[PDB]
Amino acid sequence: XXXXXXXXXXXXXXXXXXXXXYXXXXXXXXXXXXXXXXXXXXXXXXXXXXXXX
Amino acid sequence: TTALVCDNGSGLVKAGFAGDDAPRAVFPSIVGRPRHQGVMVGMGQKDSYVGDEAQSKRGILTLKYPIEHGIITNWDDMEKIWHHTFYNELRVAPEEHPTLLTEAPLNPKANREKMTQIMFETFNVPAMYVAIQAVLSLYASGRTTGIVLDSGDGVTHNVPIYEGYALPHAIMRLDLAGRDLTDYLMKILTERGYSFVTTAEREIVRDIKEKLCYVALDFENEMATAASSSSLEKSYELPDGQVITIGNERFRCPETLFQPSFIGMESAGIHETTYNSIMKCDIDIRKDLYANNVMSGGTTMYPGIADRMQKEITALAPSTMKIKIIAPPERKYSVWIGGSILASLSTFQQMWITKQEYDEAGPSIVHRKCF
Amino acid sequence: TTALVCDNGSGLVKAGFAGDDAPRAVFPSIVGRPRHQGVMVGMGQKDSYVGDEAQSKRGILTLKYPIEHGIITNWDDMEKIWHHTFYNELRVAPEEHPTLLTEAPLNPKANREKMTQIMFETFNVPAMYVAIQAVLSLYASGRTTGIVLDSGDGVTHNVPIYEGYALPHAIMRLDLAGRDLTDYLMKILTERGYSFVTTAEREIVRDIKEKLCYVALDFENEMATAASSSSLEKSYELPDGQVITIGNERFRCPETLFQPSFIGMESAGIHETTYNSIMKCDIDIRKDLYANNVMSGGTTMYPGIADRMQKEITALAPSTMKIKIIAPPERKYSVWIGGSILASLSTFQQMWITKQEYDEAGPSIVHRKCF
Numbered sequence: 001x002x003x004x005x006x007x008x009x010x011x012x013x014x015x016x017x018x019x020x021x022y023x024x025x026x027x028x029x030x031x032x033x034x035x036x037x038x039x040x041x042x043x044x045x046x047x048x049x050x051x052x053x
Numbered sequence: 054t055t056a057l058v059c060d061n062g063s064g065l066v067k068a069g070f071a072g073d074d075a076p077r078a079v080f081p082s083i084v085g086r087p088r089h090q091g092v093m094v095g096m097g098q099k100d101s102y103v104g105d106e107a108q109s110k111r112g113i114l115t116l117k118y119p120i121e122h123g124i125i126t127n128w129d130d131m132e133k134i135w136h137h138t139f140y141n142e143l144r145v146a147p148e149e150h151p152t153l154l155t156e157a158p159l160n161p162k163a164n165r166e167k168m169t170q171i172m173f174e175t176f177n178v179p180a181m182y183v184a185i186q187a188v189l190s191l192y193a194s195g196r197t198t199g200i201v202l203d204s205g206d207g208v209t210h211n212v213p214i215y216e217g218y219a220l221p222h223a224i225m226r227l228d229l230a231g232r233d234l235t236d237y238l239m240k241i242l243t244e245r246g247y248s249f250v251t252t253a254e255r256e257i258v259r260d261i262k263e264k265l266c267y268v269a270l271d272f273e274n275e276m277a278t279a280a281s282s283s284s285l286e287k288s289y290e291l292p293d294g295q296v297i298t299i300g301n302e303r304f305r306c307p308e309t310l311f312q313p314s315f316i317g318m319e320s321a322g323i324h325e326t327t328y329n330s331i332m333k334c335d336i337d338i339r340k341d342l343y344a345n346n347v348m349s350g351g352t353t354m355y356p357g358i359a360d361r362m363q364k365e366i367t368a369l370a371p372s373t374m375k376i377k378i379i380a381p382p383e384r385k386y387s388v389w390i391g392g393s394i395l396a397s398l399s400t401f402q403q404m405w406i407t408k409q410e411y412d413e414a415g416p417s418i419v420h421r422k423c424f
Numbered sequence: 425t426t427a428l429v430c431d432n433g434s435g436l437v438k439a440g441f442a443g444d445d446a447p448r449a450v451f452p453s454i455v456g457r458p459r460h461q462g463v464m465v466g467m468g469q470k471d472s473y474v475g476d477e478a479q480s481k482r483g484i485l486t487l488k489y490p491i492e493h494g495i496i497t498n499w500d501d502m503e504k505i506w507h508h509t510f511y512n513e514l515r516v517a518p519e520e521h522p523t524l525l526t527e528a529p530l531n532p533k534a535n536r537e538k539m540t541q542i543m544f545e546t547f548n549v550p551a552m553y554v555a556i557q558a559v560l561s562l563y564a565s566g567r568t569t570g571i572v573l574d575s576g577d578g579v580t581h582n583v584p585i586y587e588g589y590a591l592p593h594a595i596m597r598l599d600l601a602g603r604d605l606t607d608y609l610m611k612i613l614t615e616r617g618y619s620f621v622t623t624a625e626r627e628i629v630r631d632i633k634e635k636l637c638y639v640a641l642d643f644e645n646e647m648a649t650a651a652s653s654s655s656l657e658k659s660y661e662l663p664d665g666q667v668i669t670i671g672n673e674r675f676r677c678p679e680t681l682f683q684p685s686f687i688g689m690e691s692a693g694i695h696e697t698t699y700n701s702i703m704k705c706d707i708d709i710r711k712d713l714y715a716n717n718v719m720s721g722g723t724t725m726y727p728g729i730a731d732r733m734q735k736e737i738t739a740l741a742p743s744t745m746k747i748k749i750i751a752p753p754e755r756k757y758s759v760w761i762g763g764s765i766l767a768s769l770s771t772f773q774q775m776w777i778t779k780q781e782y783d784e785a786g787p788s789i790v791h792r793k794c795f
């Protein structure tokens with residue numbers, strides 16, 4: 001007859017229960033701006049190279 | 054002042070000052086929220102719940118699990134958890150100590166960058182570090198070389214460490230941890246067909262994983278005993294309600310580690326992965342690792358793993374050379390313990406991140422500066 | 425009658441008669457088998473699958489890879505592959521032609537002996553030969569002297585050839601080929617942390633290696649551009665499913681060839697190996713090789729390699745003397761093409777093995793008789 005607390009809480013719950021949306025939103029969006037450095041791990045690489053040849 | 058370490062190795066979460074023998078207390082990193090209209094008006098509505106508080110409250114709460122596969126799923130939830138842990142257990146303010154962070158190795162930068170960003174900004178904290186599990190595992194186990202297996206709540210590891218150095222190429226990293234195994238358990242359990250699926254219902258299994266599991270010595274022979282005997286079968290109660298009694302379904306579970314068919318993947322298993330990763334690494338070192346073989350945490354708790362592991366290595370090793378493994382009592386705590394040691398040495402004063410850098414350069418700092 | 429050549433240079437496998445411009449068709453040498461209970465009873469169960477048939481069928485199949493490091497792993501599997509190739513593509517019977525075999529140089533006798541043994545016995549074939557890659561590479565490239573670099577699917581090569589002769593001491597042979605690089609790629613890729621490990625998942629990378637790679641002109645300067653720009657970054661789909669978009673992770677990959685730290689080894693790299701191997705070889709010839717410098721196949725496909733190579737040689741050479749390199753379009757086919765030329769000349773009629781010898785003496789015949 002209505003739109004109610006009962007239904008709104010249903011929607012709320014389902015929202016809370018839906019893992020796919022929130023996890024995808026955080027992980028996939030945050031996955032893209034991942035990386036910028038002249039790695040010191042690569043500093044190791046360079047140093048080794050210096051020692052290499 | 055004094056120095057404080059968070060363990061965020063998944064499962065219950067471990068936090069404690071440098072030099073205490075064991076963390077003050079420990080929390081699952083469950084997060085959970087209401088499921089039903091709140092109908093006691095007298096009740097205060099809190100919309101999110103965590104920790105043993107939730108562990109009590111569970112039934113109308115429903116769980117979210119903020120770390121998949123060792124990757125932490127939803128940051129603000131973490132922030133809730135983290136804040137709670139400081140204030141409620143620790144009675145601690147972010148300024149109070151350097152803080153040390155505990156990381157799955159070889160996993161996406163994002164966890165580094167946001168973790169540091171949040172904790173320097175949202176918390177404001179003198180010094181920060183993030184450290185790879187195996188290092189702690191060695192320090193606690195106190196053998197400068199080694200290889201570690203620790204399959205926690207989360208993603209499951211092989212790292213050889215030689216004394217004083219990393220072999221990051223050597224390393225193997227696997228999503229096989231006990232949680233997913235447990236969820237396979239239900240697909241077992243419906244054979245006896247007492248059957249329930251939800252998150253809390255899934256955690257109920259964890260107790261059984263404590264109590265009822267033990268490692269198969271030999272699979273065929275065990276099946277033969279399974280045909281012979283019921284001593285293999287033990288009787289256990291619901292946490293409340295029924296008595297339940299369980300057959301081979303107990304021992305069959307760990308074999309997944311040796312055979313991840315049962316939830317089906319190919320990586321040829323813990324042991325074959327290990328020997329593979331060895332045969333990657335170079336020739337001379339190997340004997341030491343044959344000597345020094347080290348295991349820890351969630352799965353390892355099971356009685357007997359080390360034995361069949363040794364059986365496996367005796368299969369794969371040239372028998373000629375010595376083999377042994379270490380199985381310390383305290384493995385599940387091991388990491389945070391090692392972290393305490395890690396905290397102790399003054400060299401991190403040379404080594405910590407400071408707020409100043411975070412001012413002068415971004416999260417990018419970490420990935421050079423830390424491993 | 426007519427004469428037929430198999431290429432077993434690894435990667436897709438190439439076969440064709442003398443005098444055709446290009447082999448009739450080409451196959452990966454994947455081998456794969458079922459992973460799951462066969463549950464359509466209507467289905468015919470075939471237990472092993474190969475070639476583009478498998479490449480379609482892959483998902484429930486799982487792969488075996490019958491050549492490691494240019495060394496062919498499991499003979500009977502090869503025999504399956506080989507039989508299939510003849511009958512299904514070639515519609516050919518072993519009697520029909522002499523057949524020519526294509527070999528990594530400087531590698532264990534066993535491949536010679538069993539290969540010949542099988543193919544004379546299991547197949548029965550008028551004439552047999554096994555030939556070293558570089559010879560073909562020269563013939564196709566048509567400069568009687570030279571040095572060749574060809575880093576295929578399999579083990580990666582330096583041979584100087586002078587006109588009409590071998591310098592087997594001169595030669596360098598390396599397991600650095602693109603496959604292992606690709607498997608390193610994943611240990612890169614988890615930084616962005618879209619992450620999957622299995623064989624088919626690994627081959628999916630091959631497409632990206634086609635599409636997305638290009639050679640670093642300068643590493644430092646590239647990092648500076650990496651800080652500046654996103655044009656370095658390109659957007660690419662899953663073969664089906666998502667769009668994926670990739671940064672420096674593309675260009676960083678080939679540098680491994682120049683720096684095999686990233687999966688860590690010492691051999692000072694392609695170029696330094698080359699100049700080393702030169703400085704082994706004698707003094708006067710060198711100018712010719714400075715002129716005549718030749719590259720082919722799997723890695724070389726990348727745009728730009730020749731340029732930075734030349735940059736490297738200009739580093740290491742005394743600048744005073746001319747330098748250039750050859751980068752033909754067709755390099756990946758080059759070997760089989762050269763093989764066709766090799767097949768053409770009547771002198772192999774003097775040179776082939778015949779069944780008679782195999783009757784009268786063993787596999788031992790080869791190692792005298794062939795290079």
Ligand SMILES: Nc1ncnc2c1ncn2[C@@H]1O[C@H](COP(=O)(O)OP(=O)(O)O)[C@@H](O)[C@H]1O
Pocket residue numbers: 061062063064065203204205206207208230231232259262263264350351352354355385
């Ligand atoms: N008594 C027990 N017996 C066996 N396994 C247990 C027991 N208690 C906890 N575990 C398992 O050990 C793990 C605890 O998390 P942990 O090992 O700390 O993971 P992480 O390595 O991510 O820190 C979980 O997989 C949990 O189910």
Ligand SMILES: Nc1ncnc2c1ncn2[C@@H]1O[C@H](COP(=O)(O)OP(=O)(O)O)[C@@H](O)[C@H]1O
Pocket residue numbers: 432433434435436574575576577578579601602603630633634635721722723725726756
């Ligand atoms: N389009 C492409 N771009 C770059 N590399 C490729 C491409 N197609 C195939 N490759 C690589 O080239 C090699 C093909 O095998 P091949 O070069 O014939 O090896 P071999 O020298 O052992 O015969 C493999 O390493 C494959 O991944």
